[PDB]
Amino acid sequence: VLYVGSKTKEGVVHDVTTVAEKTKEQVTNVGGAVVTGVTAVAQKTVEGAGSIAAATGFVKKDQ
């Protein structure tokens, strides 16, 4: 690897605008996962067997 004057931009998130508006919201949850907001994940490298990069609303029940 060798850069010379290069404007590299690996693995980013930007300029994310959300104008939300809810007059009413009701969330009932039992055991599970609920996600209703803004999420932003930015990773460059994730190495590993069995791993999980960037879960969101994840439900895992193994044996």
- Residue 2 CA to residue 28 CA, distance in Å, equals 52
Does residue 14 have a known ligand-binding role?
A: yes
Binding mask 44-63 for a second copy (x = CB under 8 A): xxxxxxxxxxxxxxxxxxxx
- Residue 13 CA to residue 30 CA, distance in Å, equals 32
Query: What is the closest distance, in whole angstroms, from the C-beta atom of residue 10 to a second copy in the complex?
Result: 5
CB-based contact 31:1 (threshold 8 Å):
no
- What's the DSSP call for residue 55? -
Binding mask 14-43 for a second copy (x = CB under 8 A): xxxxxxxxxxxxxxxxxxxxxxxxxxxxxx
Q: Residue numbers of the site for a second copy (CB under 8 A)?
A: 1-63
Which residue numbers belong to the known binding site for Cu cation? 14
